[PDB]
Structure 1
Amino acid sequence: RRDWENPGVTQLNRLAAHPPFASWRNSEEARTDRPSQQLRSLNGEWRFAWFPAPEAVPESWLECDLPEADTVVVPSNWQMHGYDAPIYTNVTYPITVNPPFVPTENPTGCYSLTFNVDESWLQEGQTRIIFDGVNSAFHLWCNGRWVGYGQDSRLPSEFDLSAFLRAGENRLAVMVLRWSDGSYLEDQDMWRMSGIFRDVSLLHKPTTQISDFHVATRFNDDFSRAVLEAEVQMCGELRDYLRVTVSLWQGETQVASGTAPFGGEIIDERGGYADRVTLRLNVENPKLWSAEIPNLYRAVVELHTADGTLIEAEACDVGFREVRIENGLLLLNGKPLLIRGVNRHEHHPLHGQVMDEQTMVQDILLMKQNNFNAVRCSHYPNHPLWYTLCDRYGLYVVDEANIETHGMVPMNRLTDDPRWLPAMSERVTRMVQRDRNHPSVIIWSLGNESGHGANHDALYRWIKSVDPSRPVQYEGGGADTTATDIICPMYARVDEDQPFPAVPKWSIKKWLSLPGETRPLILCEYAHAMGNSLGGFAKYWQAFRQYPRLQGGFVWDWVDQSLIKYDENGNPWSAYGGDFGDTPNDRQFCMNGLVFADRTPHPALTEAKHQQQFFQFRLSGQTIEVTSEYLFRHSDNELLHWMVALDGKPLASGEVPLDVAPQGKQLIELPELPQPESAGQLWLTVRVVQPNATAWSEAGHISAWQQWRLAENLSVTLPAASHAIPHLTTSEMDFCIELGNKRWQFNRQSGFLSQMWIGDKKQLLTPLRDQFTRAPLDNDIGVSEATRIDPNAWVERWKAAGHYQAEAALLQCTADTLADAVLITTAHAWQHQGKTLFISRKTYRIDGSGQMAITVDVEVASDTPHPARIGLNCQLAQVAERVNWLGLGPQENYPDRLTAACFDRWDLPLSDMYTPYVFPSENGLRCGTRELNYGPHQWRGDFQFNISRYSQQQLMETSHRHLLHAEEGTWLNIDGFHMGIGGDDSWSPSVSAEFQLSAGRYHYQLVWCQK
């Protein structure tokens, strides 16, 4: 038969889709969501064995536990237990392309479980089982009898067990296949696993019962009145005594109650639905549900007789809300939304694709914590608890059908074929049937990266038809096809057009005004958070902010899909593509997250928090202007703390409770701010504080901040004549500078300061040389593999030009004795194949103060690529536990990424001065640095630096962070200038011209002193 190879057989004997039931027996357990006794978890230890093919499975198996069968926990992913490898392929299908045929070698997993039933369940009512998540397909036998078949790994499969079930002991036999024709629709850029990864349960429902029910909430102009309307459907023997009651609860307060009997109104010629009923409850001044204040009534549906006898009950949480596109705009509850969002996969580093309440909530807090308001179920329906939690905590949700044919050719190859309609069809409807009643769900998605076929069109309209409460979006075939209510491109740039043929990506700004165009624009994907990323994220935030029809988007993505591995010794290490021996694999494109798989923030995470703050500020001299981005709430837990400091010295602070309405303004007037008996930079800094604790935030939680330079006083002081003076020892190839205990040596042949002594002690491990390169970022690399070169790749360019192989050439080197200092002169050329790429002209002026002042003058050939950096490097001998600087911090920060960084005096352990990106690259850069203090040293200027125990060479040459070793001393990279990082996408250049080193001439002056 081989159903798993038939697009036309996607299930056999699978019950109908519906919202989550619990068949509660008491209205109160119901109203309270107390656990239902009619709901039984089959989770725990299960019996299990593996076979390379299903053909290989022993018939005994159906009748009796195999011997060699191990015990495992379920849910779980069999790759997680080590039965076979998990594959990390993005686009290219993990199997060969032959629809609709899976391979002969199809890792089949036979799971089994022996359990008991209560004789009570079998006398009356209906008993059925549920599988919430089976990857990818499966057959099912109970008590040696063949139950049925199911396809689609992200939606709930249920079968009626009533007829196989017996008193007490029963046995379940579950035959799981990895590959199935279902697979063709599941081409997701993620680890490819398999198994019983979701919850198995048992539900006992009465013979006569609740088959389904939907809930919808219609309002009035101003939303002062509303109507909740419920459609209840029943199954089983229909009797005139049979009644329904829908009650609406606000805690312990009944808000409304409705009672009726079955019998629909006339729908057509044949009549109406007798097994149906629609109640309409009016609610006065309803509490509106939103991501900002998730007001939530609770609805209880009860099937019962005219006599009061309660047949059974079901329930759900109700959110009063209206979602609508009107006049080119998305409305929430009548106000125009701003999507501060994020894509998220359900992923656990140890657990595989198994999801737990704990993880779930972790994510959510953090999410909420970060100025986030929406999540995108990229790209299959999520674990059911999730909707609820969002509904609960308050996040807007994009529920996506589980469909992605990315690997096809072209993409719409399946989706444009009728033969695949059904299959796809089953994938959209069921989600819908299941997820309907959840307020958090605000928009529907047809899936991902599967072109644009007629199949989309239909399903689009099907939705449209059954659920008009929400908009449909779909990006494929152009982000603007007829199967989307919303212009939802991915990787679309702010200003620049990506005119691909057929599927051009237009600047989002330009995109909205195309002749004919009128829809709202929301990015399904944008700001690829791959490694050292999110550069120019602000450039999006700005646009959004300015463009009304630019209603935001969802960052890609939330958390790194990294896996836990263990070495010989037992230390756990973060794994990725081709680490499990998976091939083909897509290396690290599985790591795009804003946080590490441990829910540990990436430094870009702050940049998002920052640009997604809900308070905006302007400063008019002494006046502060706070503006509200809340659509619905009042600044009722915010207090403004403000402060003024001088180059880090706080000349004043103060706090001011904010009292701003949504979308409103507040005027805060600062008290005259003292003058400064000194030179330097005046800076005023502000922060919003959440004095109290929320269900998501802590008390004293920081919601936003902003900072400006108030004024600056120039240093017109003239040193102080040097008491003592520096001495110069000329040698045949050295230049000695001695003063105090201190002394400098400049090797006359190389042209470089080669050694620094303070006392008897040597300060350098490595001379101090110029630098034009960086250890390549994921961004810089792209899809440049060692086997398939991307010539446009920044790394590629640099490589090919010899940026990384230049030979500096001593052009000049002189010593000179001034009246007050010794004057050192150098000049180098960096060449390659006789091309002079760079020329470096320095000066060192050492004076009696024991101060070394380096002056740097670079020239960059017009015809060569632009260098990642322009700075100096050397390896320190010293190795100190803290780093101290006057500058932009405290987190890592680059030129096209630093709007969140604040200017201050910073203190942290040398350690925190490194960012363990699993795939090593340039990192922990700190910008606009005035002062850097490390051990006995002091650097003074305007530069960006970095300091770790790892040479660039080492980073560049290492693949996994857990392979790095600290080196002797400390690596100190000091840049006069640093190149942008990019982020728009990670498989083509994302660096804005303005962040590129196009000048051709650079100037920089450092100060090298000793404290």
Structure 2
Amino acid sequence: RRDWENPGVTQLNRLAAHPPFASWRNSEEARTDRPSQQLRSLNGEWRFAWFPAPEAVPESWLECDLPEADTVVVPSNWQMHGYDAPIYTNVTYPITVNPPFVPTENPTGCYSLTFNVDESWLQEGQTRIIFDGVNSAFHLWCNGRWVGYGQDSRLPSEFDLSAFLRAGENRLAVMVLRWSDGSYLEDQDMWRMSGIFRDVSLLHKPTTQISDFHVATRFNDDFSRAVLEAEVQMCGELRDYLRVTVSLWQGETQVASGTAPFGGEIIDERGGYADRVTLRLNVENPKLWSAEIPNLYRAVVELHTADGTLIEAEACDVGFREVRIENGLLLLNGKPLLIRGVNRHEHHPLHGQVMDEQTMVQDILLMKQNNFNAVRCSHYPNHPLWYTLCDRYGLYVVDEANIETHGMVPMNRLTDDPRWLPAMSERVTRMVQRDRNHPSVIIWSLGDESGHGANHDALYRWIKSVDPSRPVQYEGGGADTTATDIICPMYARVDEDQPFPAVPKWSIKKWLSLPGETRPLILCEYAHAMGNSLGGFAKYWQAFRQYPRLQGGFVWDWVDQSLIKYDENGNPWSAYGGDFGDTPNDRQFCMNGLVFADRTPHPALTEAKHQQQFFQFRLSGQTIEVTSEYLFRHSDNELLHWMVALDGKPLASGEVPLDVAPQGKQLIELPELPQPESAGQLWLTVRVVQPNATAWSEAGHISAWQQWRLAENLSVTLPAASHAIPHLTTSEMDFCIELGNKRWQFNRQSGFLSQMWIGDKKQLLTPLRDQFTRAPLDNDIGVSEATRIDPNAWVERWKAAGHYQAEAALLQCTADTLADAVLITTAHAWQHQGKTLFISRKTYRIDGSGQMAITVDVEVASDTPHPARIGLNCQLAQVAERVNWLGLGPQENYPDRLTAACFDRWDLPLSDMYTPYVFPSENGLRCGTRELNYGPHQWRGDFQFNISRYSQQQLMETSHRHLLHAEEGTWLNIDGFHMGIGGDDSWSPSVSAEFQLSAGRYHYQLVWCQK
């Protein structure tokens, strides 16, 4: 029988699914959540051998260990040990679309273990084995004997070993098939691995046992009174003396208790459930669970005799909370949610898809440190500890079924097929059975990117019927099917419609009010953070805040799915698709995080943290109004710091504690403003600070900030008239200027400033030429490659117009002498195939002070694609330690990604001005800059800029950061104007009309001087 090729067989002899057990035998250990003797982890050094196909596996592996087998760590993906390649594929299957068959070359992992078991486990009780995650299907042997079969890579498989166990040495044998009929429901946009990648364990239950328990909490109108209902189910021999007690703890205090005999109410004509009982505990004035305040109670479920003997106990965390959709709103505890969320894949750059507590906690802190409150299990149920961490630190969780059929044509070919409903239903139902007791799970998701079929309809209704306490969502088939309670599109832009046939992605604002529509909107994915991205993020959050039925979204996504590779000198580097010999591959598309794989943030993270603040600020005269957006908590851990500065120079500051109620306003009056002496701009800043450490943040955490322009004093005083005069020395080839030890050389053929001098030290390498192009970002490229060109792409537009290779064709180069200065006047035109793309007109001016005032005016042919940048570049000779700039930062910012940045004097090392995206591009831009010191140099004006050892050439030519090499001296780009980075999605132009450079005529002036 080929079960890995049959969707009518998803398991054999697999025991039923259930909430997480521990079979505690001591109620205090249960209550306190301490370890239980009755649950052994079998994680450790296992034996493993790899095979090309299940048919190549010898029959001697079932009885004895293969000598050629290696001793490896479990849990793990055998790819991370390098037995075969990991495959990154986005949409297209890693196998031939041939339901139900998989390839006859099917990578097969033969795991096994020799173990020892307690005498009392052999004496009595049920001993089961629990593989938390096996990817993708497997057969199980114990002591040579066949036990059962399992599918679905992201939920636990459990089998009874009691009848298989022997005295002394026992032997497991787990045959892991990488591909199965199960692979057809597991087509997520991620790395394709396999193995026993989650916990393996042994649970020892009494024969008369708790087999299930359900914890429900309903409320009255003000949540001042709550009932806790606990349905308890058992297996084994019922006896008149058995009892169940459900107790509820808050700290070290019982709050209420329920004790009763098995025997449920009459259900139907035939009676009730004799093997069940339902306990009701009344709880007055309960502490409610929210992400804002993760108030947890503890529930202990004791199976015991009326005479007072405990048989076993199971337990969970309880958060009193109600989630309903009323009058078009997602309410939590009767308050409307604002989902500040992100999609999170289970990923590690060393371990693949194996998860650990240290990583999770790192992820959970960071997210909450960067103003996130919700997360989507994109796109499968997670390692079980995740929900517990979420319950305790406080995050709203979308628990998502392990069904994805992105590769089907059309996407619903399987989800509309009733032959596939059983395989689908297992994947949905078994998530609930497992996860229904976690307070942190607020929404059930029916899977991802699988179109819309009757199967989705069928399972939605199953969930509604089985768990009325939670809304069900699903993006498939239009994001507003009969199969979702929430309009939950992916990448639906804010203002712009995208009227795709059958599945249009409307503008979110317009979507809400489509005729007859009432449901709320929360994007299941938005703001593709791929490479230099998240441009246009502030536009979402403004709309989220204005429209009450817009209730947020989950960013795509948390972490970069890069995997560590090592080089010839044994040095690590981050690798993406096709870097493993895997093909077809979707290259750098596995990498869309706000953080790098090692959990270093991309600079897009600070934008998100800023936009997702919980306090809103207004300024009206000298009056700051602070608004809390919190639904539940007061600001019991906040003080507002305020700061006024005249162009980076502190003028005054202070502290006022925030005592803001949830959704209230504090009016903080600033003292009589100290009116400044000199000339510049006053900028107000406010940072909100948490003085006390929490479980999620250090003492001093800055949770919110905002700046404002106050009074500006325009500079009027004339230059202190110097008594030096710059001398023009005109030759045949170069207009040359002197002034003391300063020397300027303008070339007559090129028409550009070719070299500067300080004494005998030349200042340049590459001349100060114009630039109208950038090394393309992932958003610029999109889906386009050399073999299939996407003609629509921003980059392919610039390539096909000539933007990238067009050459300066000097129209004029003159040099008149001024009274107190020297004045050079250039003109250039850039051409390609007889078309004039850009005319550039400049006027350099050098006075007796050393200051060189460059004035630039550019013309842009209205019918060429709008250019990426309008500015200048030169390769400076000196290599420096510091960069110093008055303007936005300190971090990298772009026209549509600069809200998070702050105007001030910033001093960073040169390498912080370079952003090491795994796919190299335009990076380290800092906008709205007025002054820029590096070495002895200084550029004043109103511009944006980037300064690195990498040319735009090297960046656009190299595909991996690790293969870049510092160049001689330092490349400087100085931009009058830069186009948006975009990123509403990464497969179509997404730079908004107001951040495209479209004016036609552009002006900007620079001042260059040695300090």
Per the shorter chain, which TM-score range?
Answer: over 0.9
1:119–1:168 CA contact under 8 A, matched in 2: no
1:473–1:485 CA contact under 8 A, matched in 2: yes
Structure 1, residues 326-370: CA drift from partner, whole Å, max 9, x if none?
Answer: 000000000000000000000000000000000000000001001
| Displacement after TM superposition at 1:695 (Å) | 0.2
What's the counterpart of residue 955 of structure 1? 955
Structure 2 spans left out of the alignment, 5+ residues:
none
| Displacement after TM superposition at 1:207 (Å) | 0.6
| Displacement after TM superposition at 1:513 (Å) | 0.2
Residues of 2 paired with 1:71 and 1:106: CA distance? 22
| Displacement after TM superposition at 1:816 (Å) | 1.1
Residues of 2 paired with 1:655 and 1:135: CA distance? 55
| Displacement after TM superposition at 1:118 (Å) | 1.1
1:628–1:661 CA contact under 8 A, matched in 2: yes
Residues of 2 paired with 1:699 and 1:656: CA distance? 17
Residues of 2 paired with 1:375 and 1:785: CA distance? 33
Structure 1, residues 451-510: CA drift from partner, whole Å, max 9, x if none?
Answer: 000000000000000001100000000000000000000010000001000000000000
Runs of 4 or more off by more than 2 Å in structure 1? Answer: none
Structure 1, residues 207-246: CA drift from partner, whole Å, max 9, x if none?
Answer: 1010100100010000101010100001000000000000
Structure 1, residues 865-884: CA drift from partner, whole Å, max 9, x if none?
Answer: 11110000000001111000
User: Is residue 942 of structure 1 aligned with residue 942 of structure 2?
Assistant: yes
Structure 1, residues 838-884: CA drift from partner, whole Å, max 9, x if none?
Answer: 00000100010011010000000001011110000000001111000
1:615–1:627 CA contact under 8 A, matched in 2: yes
| Displacement after TM superposition at 1:721 (Å) | 1.4
What's the counterpart of residue 118 of structure 1? 118
1:722–1:820 CA contact under 8 A, matched in 2: no
Structure 1, residues 956-997: CA drift from partner, whole Å, max 9, x if none?
Answer: 000000000000000000000000010100000110000000
Structure 1, residues 660-689: CA drift from partner, whole Å, max 9, x if none?
Answer: 000111000000111010111011000100
What's the counterpart of residue 973 of structure 2? 973
Q: Secondary structure at the match of 2:412?
A: helix
Residues of 2 paired with 1:253 and 1:1010: CA distance? 72
Q: Secondary structure at the match of 1:486?
A: coil
Residues of 2 paired with 1:203 and 1:750: CA distance? 80
| Displacement after TM superposition at 1:321 (Å) | 0.3
User: Is residue 227 of structure 1 aligned with residue 227 of structure 2?
Assistant: yes
Q: Secondary structure at the match of 2:101?
A: coil
Structure 1, residues 533-552: CA drift from partner, whole Å, max 9, x if none?
Answer: 00010000000000000000
Q: Secondary structure at the match of 1:263?
A: coil
1:530–1:779 CA contact under 8 A, matched in 2: yes
Question: What's the % identity of the aligned pairs?
Answer: 100
| Displacement after TM superposition at 1:834 (Å) | 1.0
Residues of 2 paired with 1:544 and 1:536: CA distance? 13
Structure 1, residues 264-294: CA drift from partner, whole Å, max 9, x if none?
Answer: 1000100000000000000000000000000
Residues of 2 paired with 1:42 and 1:271: CA distance? 43
Q: Secondary structure at the match of 2:864?
A: coil
Residues of 1 paired with 2:134 and 2:381: CA distance? 13
Structure 1 spans left out of the alignment, 5+ residues:
none
Residues of 2 paired with 1:744 and 1:167: CA distance? 92
| Displacement after TM superposition at 1:1000 (Å) | 0.3
| Displacement after TM superposition at 1:711 (Å) | 1.3
User: Is residue 87 of structure 1 aligned with residue 79 of structure 2?
Assistant: no
| Displacement after TM superposition at 1:716 (Å) | 0.5
Residues of 2 paired with 1:673 and 1:631: CA distance? 34
Structure 1, residues 276-314: CA drift from partner, whole Å, max 9, x if none?
Answer: 000000000000000000000000000000110010000
What's the counterpart of residue 776 of structure 1? 776
| Displacement after TM superposition at 1:168 (Å) | 2.1
Q: Where do 1:353-368 residues align within 5 Å?
A: 353-368=353-368
Residues of 2 paired with 1:716 and 1:729: CA distance? 33
| Displacement after TM superposition at 1:122 (Å) | 1.4
| Displacement after TM superposition at 1:722 (Å) | 2.1
Q: Secondary structure at the match of 1:510?
A: helix
1:493–1:508 CA contact under 8 A, matched in 2: yes
Residues of 1 paired with 2:641 and 2:458: CA distance? 54
Residues of 2 paired with 1:209 and 1:736: CA distance? 95
Structure 1, residues 5-59: CA drift from partner, whole Å, max 9, x if none?
Answer: 0000000000000000000010000000010110000000000101100000000
What's the counterpart of residue 5 of structure 2? 5
| Displacement after TM superposition at 1:919 (Å) | 0.1
Structure 1, residues 736-759: CA drift from partner, whole Å, max 9, x if none?
Answer: 100010000000111000000011
What's the counterpart of residue 47 of structure 1? 47
Residues of 1 paired with 2:691 and 2:105: CA distance? 60
Structure 1, residues 154-184: CA drift from partner, whole Å, max 9, x if none?
Answer: 0000000000001221000000000000000
| Displacement after TM superposition at 1:933 (Å) | 0.1
Residues of 2 paired with 1:270 and 1:678: CA distance? 91
Residues of 2 paired with 1:619 and 1:324: CA distance? 36
TM-score, length of structure 2 as denominator length: 1.00
1:22–1:39 CA contact under 8 A, matched in 2: yes
Structure 1, residues 70-105: CA drift from partner, whole Å, max 9, x if none?
Answer: 110000000000000000000000001100001000
| Displacement after TM superposition at 1:194 (Å) | 0.3
Q: Secondary structure at the match of 1:255?
A: strand
Residues of 2 paired with 1:714 and 1:168: CA distance? 89
Q: Secondary structure at the match of 2:419?
A: helix
Residues of 1 paired with 2:282 and 2:989: CA distance? 56
Residues of 2 paired with 1:720 and 1:116: CA distance? 91
1:812–1:827 CA contact under 8 A, matched in 2: yes
Count residues in correspondence: 1011
1:625–1:668 CA contact under 8 A, matched in 2: yes
Q: Secondary structure at the match of 1:588?
A: helix
Structure 1, residues 899-942: CA drift from partner, whole Å, max 9, x if none?
Answer: 00000001000010000000000001000000000001000000
Residues of 1 paired with 2:251 and 2:722: CA distance? 79
Residues of 2 paired with 1:250 and 1:388: CA distance? 17
| Displacement after TM superposition at 1:404 (Å) | 0.4
Residues of 2 paired with 1:568 and 1:23: CA distance? 51
| Displacement after TM superposition at 1:251 (Å) | 1.0
| Displacement after TM superposition at 1:575 (Å) | 0.5
Residues of 1 paired with 2:733 and 2:902: CA distance? 45
1:135–1:153 CA contact under 8 A, matched in 2: yes
1:748–1:813 CA contact under 8 A, matched in 2: yes
Structure 1, residues 174-201: CA drift from partner, whole Å, max 9, x if none?
Answer: 0000000000000010000000000000
What's the counterpart of residue 18 of structure 1? 18
| Displacement after TM superposition at 1:119 (Å) | 1.3
Q: Secondary structure at the match of 1:153?
A: coil
User: Is residue 681 of structure 1 aligned with residue 685 of structure 2?
Assistant: no
Q: Secondary structure at the match of 1:358?
A: helix
Q: Secondary structure at the match of 1:223?
A: coil
What's the counterpart of residue 572 of structure 1? 572
What's the counterpart of residue 921 of structure 1? 921
Structure 1, residues 706-765: CA drift from partner, whole Å, max 9, x if none?
Answer: 100001011101102121110111010101100010000000111000000011100001
| Displacement after TM superposition at 1:124 (Å) | 0.9
Residues of 1 paired with 2:787 and 2:45: CA distance? 45
1:831–1:837 CA contact under 8 A, matched in 2: yes
Residues of 2 paired with 1:629 and 1:361: CA distance? 26
User: Is residue 592 of structure 1 aligned with residue 592 of structure 2?
Assistant: yes
Residues of 1 paired with 2:787 and 2:698: CA distance? 50
Residues of 1 paired with 2:928 and 2:123: CA distance? 77
Q: Secondary structure at the match of 2:260?
A: strand
Structure 1, residues 634-669: CA drift from partner, whole Å, max 9, x if none?
Answer: 011000000000001110000110000001110000
Q: Which deviates more, 160-169 or 477-486?
A: 160-169
What's the counterpart of residue 415 of structure 1? 415
Q: Secondary structure at the match of 2:29?
A: helix
What's the counterpart of residue 748 of structure 1? 748
